[PDB]
Amino acid sequence: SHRKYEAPRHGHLGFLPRKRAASIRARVKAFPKDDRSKPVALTSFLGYKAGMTTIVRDLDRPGSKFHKREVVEAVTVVDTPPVVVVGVVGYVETPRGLRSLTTVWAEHLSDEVKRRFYKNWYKSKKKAFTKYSAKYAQDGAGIERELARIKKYASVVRVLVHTQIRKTPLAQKKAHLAEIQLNGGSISEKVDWAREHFEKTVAVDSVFEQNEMIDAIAVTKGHGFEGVTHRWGTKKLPRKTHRGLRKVACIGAWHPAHVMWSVARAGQRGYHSRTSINHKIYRVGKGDDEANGATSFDRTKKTITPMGGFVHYGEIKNDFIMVKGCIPGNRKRIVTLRKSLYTNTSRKALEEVSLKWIDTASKFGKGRFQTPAEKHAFMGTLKKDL
Amino acid sequence: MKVEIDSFSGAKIYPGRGTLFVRGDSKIFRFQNSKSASLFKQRKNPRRIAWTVLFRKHHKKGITEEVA
Amino acid sequence: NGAQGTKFRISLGLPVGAIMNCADNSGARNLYIIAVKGSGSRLNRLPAASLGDMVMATVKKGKPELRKKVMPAIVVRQAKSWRRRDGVFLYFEDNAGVIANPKGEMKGSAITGPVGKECADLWPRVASNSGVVV
RNA sequence: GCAGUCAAGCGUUCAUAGCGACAUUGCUUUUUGAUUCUUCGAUGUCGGCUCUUCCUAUCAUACCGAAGCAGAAUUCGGUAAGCGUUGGAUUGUUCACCCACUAAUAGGGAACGUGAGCUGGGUUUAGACCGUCGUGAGACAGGUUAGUUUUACCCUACUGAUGAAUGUUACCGCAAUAGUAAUUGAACUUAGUACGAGAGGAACAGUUCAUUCGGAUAAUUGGUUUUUGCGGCUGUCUGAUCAGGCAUUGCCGCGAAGCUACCAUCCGCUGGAUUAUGGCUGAACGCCUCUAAGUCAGAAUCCAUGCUAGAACGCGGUGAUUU
RNA sequence: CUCUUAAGGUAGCCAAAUGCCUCGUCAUCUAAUUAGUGACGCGCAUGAAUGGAUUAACGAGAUUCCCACUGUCCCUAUCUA
RNA sequence: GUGAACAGCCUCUAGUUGAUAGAAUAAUGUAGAUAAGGGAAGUCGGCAAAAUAGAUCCGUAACUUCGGGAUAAGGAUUGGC
């Protein structure tokens, strides 16, 4: 009856229902708009969140107080071993949508994706793709038939790829498979490229570069059944309340004689699929390089791995990306990294970053040192030693 | 970038990995952590804090270097 | 208004009701906050000031001609820590402000103690009388 | 209460920029009344708190038009309810009045929303005091103080969580439909420019920041501590010593991990059609006319893009299918 | 000076637990007070054992202010049974 | 035993170890706690909670029925050997 003091709505309604996601692997509901006047390249990637750290770099923002001055920004690390391509998928356009007509596989699939196709691998006969691998045993008549069908039809093309989870220190012997859109000219060229890359690997170095803005797609950290106050940011009721204060007091008016969809109730917090945009890449690094954690100024030979490892993940013995800011999901979650769907000109996408130093001190406590050599030099000899 | 030092042991501080305090005159104090920062508030003496530099180098501990 | 430029987000420690030292010579001891100047609105949220902020305030102890009235003040020292873009977390010991007409000119002639670079860069006439800074 | 009409007059001249007497037609039902149809084998009967939605007769933000509009500031009016619309002193208060910040501090509804949501200050039981009245009992929208606020395990609704039936099982997808969130200001510069006699005094673009809202994250900073992790301290018991028990976690400092904070950080899209309105060509009317045909631009609006779920009876693709 | 009736509120006291008009008026406390305190008192309707005024001390009485204090609150969060 | 003390806390004697249990550690709860900056802005209203708290020394106002007020306020010390 005219709320005596107007204030705004608690929570966002366009992120409903805040239910548990169907999978840990979030769906890509959109890919970048295709430009068919360029080569064939991936529009997105799959990685695993390793953790976070802090970065020093010099600012290039004129008019700002801190132009040509250093700042201290945080970054998330995503370990990204090379992704291997095992399939090609063709979608044709209908008045009901883009519809998958067929999907072609490679001859030799690894036992990781083969593991994905099973729920009990240790006991099973592993007879998934045997009769398919035998279709290859001829010249590939039907295989080229299918590829030609795709060439004829197939408005769009998606590549089935999977991860080398065995290279990450997780114990998840079963890899993550995904469809990735191609955004390059000549569907013919796409499928020939794909066929060339069957059984073959593809690295982030070819797909991403410095200063490119990307979207991040992951599953938010789950928190189970949670109360309305932290799930929605509702005001706590006073101390004097009978029957709870971590509640909503007025759940609805008499008429409409119903509880509305828009009122804050209790339920699932976390484990939502969320798509976060405009995270800048600050480094595209290589596990081959012992000096991943090094910098042009930081000529100390050091990998990105902190002292004692990334907490709850492990060490990085593969390639990686340290990307600005914060990314949905907790450590060990499969993240889908998509290149942005729009041309940025904010001068924040246009600011070329040159790193200056990387924190590689232990995150399992208040780390004060960056290397054990530094530690040994500063402290000296211990009761143990020689 | 500079690596300042704890104002209560002399322990190194990379950026962000500590808090700063300014006393009511101007005297600045860099602390690596709540630990040293709290010891400061408790009005404490590193020359008694067995594990700080200011103790170890009062006691001539570990150096073995000035005669090399 | 009356300040030379902008300011970054900075952590809040002085709501209305709080009381801080008049770190100038103008003749007051305290400075009683009543209102922040920018301070957009929200239900049952209190306008919180910060370092370098202009406010409106009164005196509770000082000269008798200096009390029982409203006037604009400016914060210079904040015990509630904040962060600058250089990652440093810092904080003074106390809450200290001074007095000024709205335009950015002090009534006092001088200042007693350290001051933040933000208020310095943002309020020159203060920045002139300003002794040591940070 | 609110909106219209005619125009006598104001408006220096000028009814109609703005107003508008005498009169007059209407709207609403958030005022208060009139009624007494419903409920007296009972609907919990002030106000506050919290929360959502809705309305426009729009306070501000957007695009506009007009002005006795030079500029600035202001006023009148249109589309618009997309987003917002505060903090405190006194009072039980609604209301009312003050202080102050603000772009603005617009008004109203939903059983005068909301008591198995809270409170119980007020009214409105029993106790007690005063005043006035009454011979007296006792009374008084006259004052004052103290005065038990119950039940959900059910149905629906909502929130989130399962799941049968489709040949089985596994993997990848489509996306019907439903929802949607971005907001507002300041500083610099434009520019002491334009404008103006001066007085004073803009705007567009651009740059940097901020507010409100929202979504994630925990590197760092802070907090939290049953890591009962280390140390210390009291009483007492184990003869001592070491080591340890009990003190409803014995207490204190540190206290990582984990969780968390505008008390930390990061992030918050672009195309079309449109309204008002201004115009094009141009008829009707041999002229005129943005309009009738037809047409260009054009808003914080709509639909899309993007965003969340994925129909459990909507679907496709693919692998495998038992001595 | 009178009528009136038996006499006409004396000392004292107050918008007070009594005052309608009432947020009474002045001052003071406040940034701001329908609150409070002190003062005015033609006081609807104060008042002398139907006890008046004042009053140290005491009050699980009612009321205001101040200092300290504090998660009551801005603004919520974490932990244990 | 500690300690002013039959207080609280631990123990000897004697009696008990019995009050449906098990696994998890979600929300909301009951009881309990701690929390940066601020400090009653909340609220009818400081309800609740916090703070102070023992002993010794020091000093201890107004007003007063001269007895008190008063632990006033208000500062400093406490260990072990």
Choose among A283, A294, A298, A306: nearest CA to A372. Answer: A306
For chain B, list the contacting chains (3+ Cβ pairs, <8 Å).
A, C
**Which residue is listed with tokens 């101390």?**
A239
Output the CA–CA distances (angstroms, integers) from residue A78 to A329, A334, A341, in the order listed. Answer: 11, 9, 21
Output the CA–CA distances (angstroms, integers) from residue C75 to A208, A359, C4, in the order listed. Answer: 46, 34, 15
Q: Which residues contact A16 (CB under 8 A, 6 or more apart)?
A: none
By the 8 A CB rule, do C99 and C29 touch? no
By the 8 A CB rule, do A208 and A281 touch? yes
* Beta-sheet pairing, A213-219 with A273-285: antiparallel
By the 8 A CB rule, do A103 and A117 touch? no
CB contact under 8 A, B25 and C114: yes
For chain C, list the contacting chains (3+ Cβ pairs, <8 Å).
A, B
Q: Which nucleotides of E are covered by protein (CB under 7 A)?
A: 29-32, 67, 72-78
Q: Which tokens is B63 given?
A: 């150096």
Task: Find the helix or strand (DSSP H, E) in which B29 lies.
Answer: strand B28-31
CB nearest to B15's CB, from C87, C90, C94: C87
**Which residue is listed with tokens 């114990």?**
A171
Choose among A113, A205, A114, A128: nearest CA to A164. Answer: A113
What are the φ and ψ backbone dihedral angles of A359, each rounded to 5 degrees?
-75, 115
The CA-to-CA distance between both ends of chain A, in Å, stands at 81
Task: Find the helix or strand (DSSP H, E) in which B13 lies.
Answer: strand B12-13
What is the rounded distance in angstroms from the CA atom of residue C66 to the CA atom of residue A139? Answer: 99
Q: Which tokens is C73 given?
A: 């003040």
Torsion sign (Cα): A100, A102, A105, A110: positive
Q: Which tokens is A139 given?
A: 């010249």
Q: Return the DSSP state at C64.
A: G
- DSSP three-state, residue B56: helix
- DSSP three-state, residue B21: strand
Q: What Rg, from alpha-carbon coordinates, does chain C have? A: 14
By the 8 A CB rule, do B11 and A368 touch? yes
Torsion sign (Cα): C11, C16, C19, C20: positive
CA angle A348, A354, A360 (to 5 degrees): 110
By the 8 A CB rule, do C96 and C77 touch? yes
What is the rounded distance in angstroms from the CA atom of residue C34 to the CA atom of residue C13? Answer: 14
Task: Find the helix or strand (DSSP H, E) in which B37 lies.
Answer: helix B34-41
Choose among A161, A160, A168: nearest CA to A48. Answer: A168
- DSSP three-state, residue C56: strand
Task: Find the helix or strand (DSSP H, E) in which B22 lies.
Answer: strand B19-22
What is the rounded distance in angstroms from the CA atom of residue A385 to the CA atom of residue A87? Answer: 55
Experimental method: cryo-EM
What is the rounded distance in angstroms from the CA atom of residue A319 to the CA atom of residue A71? Answer: 26
Question: In Å, what is the separation between the CA of B53 and the C1' of D245?
Answer: 39
- DSSP three-state, residue C63: coil
- DSSP three-state, residue C36: strand
Task: Find the helix or strand (DSSP H, E) in which C97 lies.
Answer: strand C96-101
How many residue pairs bridge chain A and chain C with CB atoms within 8 Å of each other? 22
Amino acid letter at A193? W
State the CB neighbour count (10 A cutoff) for residue C104: 19
Choose among A149, A159, A161: nearest CA to A88. Answer: A159
How would you write chain A as a 3-class SS string?
A: CCCCCCCCCCCCHHHCCCCCCCCCCCCCCCCCCCCCCCCCCECEEEEEEEEEEEEEEECCCCCCCCCCCEEEEEEEEEECCCEEEEEEEEEEEECCEEEEEEEEECCCCCCCHHHHCCCCCCCCCCCCCHHHHCHHHCCCHHHHHHHHHHHHCCCEEEEEEECCCCCCCCCCCCCCEEEEEECCCCHHHHHHHHHHHECCEECHHHCCCCCCEEEEEEECCCCCEECHHHHHCCCCCCCCCCCCCCCCCCCCCCCCCCCCCCCCCCEECCCCEEEEEEEEEEEEECCCCCCCCCCCCCCCCCCCCCCCCECCCECCCCCEEEEECCCCCCCCCEEEEEECCCCCCCCCCCCCCCEEEECCCCCCCCCCCCCHHHHHHHHCCCCCCC
Question: In Å, what is the separation between the CA of C31 and the C1' of E28?
Answer: 23
**Which residue is listed with tokens 């001609």?**
C65
Documented resolution in Å:
5.3
Task: Find the helix or strand (DSSP H, E) in which C55 lies.
Answer: strand C54-58
What are the φ and ψ backbone dihedral angles of B40, each rounded to 5 degrees?
-60, -50
Cis peptide before A17 (omega within 30 of 0): yes
CB nearest to B1's CB, from A56, A379, A381: A56
What are A97's strand-pairing partners?
A94
What are the φ and ψ backbone dihedral angles of A315, each rounded to 5 degrees?
-95, 165
Question: Is C105 near chain B, with CB under 8 Å?
Answer: no
What is the rounded distance in angstroms from the CA atom of residue A352 to the CA atom of residue A342? Answer: 18
What is the rounded distance in angstroms from the CA atom of residue B23 to the CA atom of residue B26? Answer: 6
Distance (Å) from the alpha carbon of B24 to chain A's nearest alpha carbon:
27
State the CB neighbour count (10 A cutoff) for residue A220: 19
Q: Which tokens is C112 given?
A: 């007693």
Please name the residues between 62 and 81 in chain A that touch chain B, using a CB distance below 8 Å: 70, 72
By the 8 A CB rule, do C106 and C54 touch? no
By the 8 A CB rule, do A361 and A305 touch? no
What are A338's strand-pairing partners?
A44, A215
Choose among C2, C9, C3: nearest CA to C119. Answer: C3
What is the rounded distance in angstroms from the CA atom of residue C5 to the CA atom of residue C22? Answer: 24
What is the rounded distance in angstroms from the CA atom of residue C98 to the CA atom of residue C28? Answer: 9
The crossing angle, in degrees rounded to 10, of helices A141-152 and A187-197 is: 150
Q: Where do runs of H (alpha helix) occur along C3-133?
A: 117-122, 124-129
Q: Return the DSSP state at B26.
A: S
Q: Which residue of A has its CA nearest to B12?
A: A368
Torsion sign (Cα): C39, C43, C46, C50: negative
By the 8 A CB rule, do B14 and A359 touch? yes
A365-382 core/surface letters (b: 16 or more CB in 10 A; e: else): eebbbbeeeeeeeeeeee
What is the rounded distance in angstroms from the CA atom of residue B43 to the CA atom of residue B33? Answer: 16
